[PDB]
Design a protein around this ligand. Sequence first.
Ligand SMILES: O=C(/C=C/c1cccnc1)NCCCCC1CCN(C(=O)c2ccccc2)CC1
Ligand SMILES: O=C(/C=C/c1cccnc1)NCCCCC1CCN(C(=O)c2ccccc2)CC1
Lengths: 465, 464
Amino acid sequence: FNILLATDSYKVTHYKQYPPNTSKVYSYFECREYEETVFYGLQYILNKYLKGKVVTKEKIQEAKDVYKEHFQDDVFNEKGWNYILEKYDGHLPIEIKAVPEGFVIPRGNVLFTVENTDPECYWLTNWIETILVQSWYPITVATNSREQKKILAKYLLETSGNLDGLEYKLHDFGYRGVSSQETAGIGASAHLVNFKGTDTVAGLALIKKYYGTKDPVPGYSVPAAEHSTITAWGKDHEKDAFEHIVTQFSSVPVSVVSDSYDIYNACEKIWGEDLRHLIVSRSTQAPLIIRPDSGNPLDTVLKVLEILGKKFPVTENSKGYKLLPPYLRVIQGDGVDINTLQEIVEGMKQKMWSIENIAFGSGGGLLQKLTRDLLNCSFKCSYVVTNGLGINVFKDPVADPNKRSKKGRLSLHRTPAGNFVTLEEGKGDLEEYGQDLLHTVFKNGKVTKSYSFDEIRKNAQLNIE
Amino acid sequence: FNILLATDSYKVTHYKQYPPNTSKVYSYFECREYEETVFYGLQYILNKYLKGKVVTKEKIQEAKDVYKEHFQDDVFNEKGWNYILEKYDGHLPIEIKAVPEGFVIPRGNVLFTVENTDPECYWLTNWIETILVQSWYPITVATNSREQKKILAKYLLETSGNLDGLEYKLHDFGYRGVSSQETAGIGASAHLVNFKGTDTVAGLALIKKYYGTKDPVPGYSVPAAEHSTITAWGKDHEKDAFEHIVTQFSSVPVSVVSDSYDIYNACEKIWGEDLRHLIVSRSTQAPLIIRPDSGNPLDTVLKVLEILGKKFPVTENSKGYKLLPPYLRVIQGDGVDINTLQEIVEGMKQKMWSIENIAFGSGGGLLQKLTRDLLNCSFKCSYVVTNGLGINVFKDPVADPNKRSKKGRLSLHRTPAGNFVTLEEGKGDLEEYGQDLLHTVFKNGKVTKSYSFDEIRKNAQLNI
Ligand SMILES: O=C(/C=C/c1cccnc1)NCCCCC1CCN(C(=O)c2ccccc2)CC1
Ligand SMILES: O=C(/C=C/c1cccnc1)NCCCCC1CCN(C(=O)c2ccccc2)CC1
């Protein structure tokens, strides 16, 4: 990895574009006015990419060589990068301030700020815009996950009277449906801020290396079947596959995909009649979890439940809702995103089925079907010093007021009612509001303030009680 | 990187689930059921992740230790992975066949197949599903970018006489808009299959390392402003910023974002009146490229062109379409995806503006606004041998016929009309449809067949 090759091409040319006699470029990050976001992921970037000796003589040559061919021109700030190497032993002369990781903050608020600590390195602040803005992803995944936990919480509490097992109600299936290996790790870590169940293994090693937990691992899974693991038996021997798998895993929770050929047959005849004897003998700590995987998600879940309720002993009510026997549960893992999750739980409630009956799995919707536009994650310059004189700067495009950016030196404060407010124009310097809620997390090549994953999870809790 | 920790956790438990006495698991990849896809990206994966000694005693132990806590149990197949280490010096006993990279293939065709080459390693075929399926991404980016080149080609050809400058008409802006550094490299590389213009400076090193070009680099850029380099001058000094930037870059092409405060004022008064003398003096080798960056993408572009054609000398084409003077162009890099790209070029054509006047930039739309559902990229088992007998294997869910998978030994063939067909059930073994078009690209830890990025580009060319 070469930090000199980890920016937008045009930013290689920006040092020649700022006003001459500019000693400071100050920039901030916001989710431009999902009315509330989880700040997560910066610490990963600081450690992996920005910390320590990130500039060497070889990295300067490498970049020089590439940019020459790439631009067909000698645009590249070799002098500027040599200065960092010579004066700071290749450590970035940058200070970053940030709200604690895990903090849940309404949109339109400053989440972190970036400025150079050396007047020569004025160009450096926005060189690292590209890398830092990619924090949009862990933030958006953590936020979207939490918002889905909010819906589950609402309906679990309503139908059941509590929240038992909530943190296992959305399972991460997103590993293969993601753009890369690195994305898998970052994204599965963000989901684990809210839940404890994951099939995306990459996230466990990221967390332990960059954040850490008191617990040996932040995430957990159970034995589960695949379509290959059923279909390999031959279409006439689906029952032999089912029987073999529940028996191999008789003592632990086991999930078995049941829609290879006909899910409704599989539930009514195979599980409900042929193999019922192997199911009803199962421990409460080791349910069979039937996994539908196709058809309309709502329509299929409801039909699966109606089938099963008539083949197995249903109890009712502490809230009036119906509950499968303890050794039998369902997991819906196809076509689940924030939109369809809400339609499924609402449809179940309408049909008198408790949310304690179901868990969800999500792949693409959970990790890949997200974009920087969702929360309008943006990084903009708000303050510059030119000729020893500070000015408050901003953009304000005529045709789009929603793209207007903040002015001057910023700070994040607690309001009298206990909410959040960003102060602009250096106004935080007055003592009218609180202490600044942002902390220096990186300065001159060193991470100066760290958070464990246990603190992050704590910070990102839902209110309910 | 540890390949024992690079799978869906449930696949850790799959070796216990296949029928006893299974010696062969044979699986394939398809874009199930955007009628044609560019096959790109597998080679990166083979080289980065699957080739060489991928298994060590340390990697086995690490995986053992993680999975013990992850499952709260001992389900990890230590014995199976130790057999690889001992027998094959940590090299995977797997064979993969694949269509040549860059190949443009209709949906529903086999693109690659995977099978184990040792009976002991029957569970290994689908262990590497997860990693291989991430192919969906370079394939989907390459396909979507090509589709966008098709639209541009159609409209450039119609409004001007030709396709001059086509390969520079969609610029990659997506570096900050993707999920990671690795994603940036993969995705920008995939866009470069179709175009030469990029600001995503991670795709170049990927291409040189895994694919290679004859030219020093596969992608190019020019000097350009961002809002910070305009806005830092102060609101009242936007003209000073413009003048400074174009003077610093007066002999090369330069893009200048002009919507910091008022895009329409900047074009008509600042570029069109105040600084006109610095624009009209520019070389044809070095146009000023005005960059709008907000508002309705089509309404903005059209008003931008109208403004400018009335401040600068416009010429009318051999096709009847209007053309800015050679030192002035436009790049629209906000809200551009395949849908809005089409609407802009059509709206331009309707108002008699040639596509030679414009280039596009695209960020999240080009590299992030994509899913595995778009082309239905899917890896499925189609053939197994158990107790010495091979059986054709498949799923066929009652409520979704579009999820049905292919049966038995698969093969890709050329039809009598010169099209593609996938033959199932080992029927390719009959000499009826000629030679199998898939090539062995990986076998027993070695890459056996590979392609230059120059070959890939050539394969991915448009008919036009
Ligand atoms: O099925 C898959 C993975 C599928 C997959 C993975 C990757 C790619 N493609 C497909 N994994 C099985 C995970 C189950 C985890 C927990 C066990 C404990 N649990 C209940 O006991 C339960 C309580 C109440 C309601 C339901 C269940 C809640 C769910
Ligand atoms: O504006 C940006 C980058 C913006 C950005 C990057 C990253 C993130 N956010 C924003 N870059 C300048 C790109 C120009 C590249 C080529 C030069 C040659 N060229 C024409 O001469 C031309 C011919 C016909 C029509 C138009 C132009 C075609 C376009």
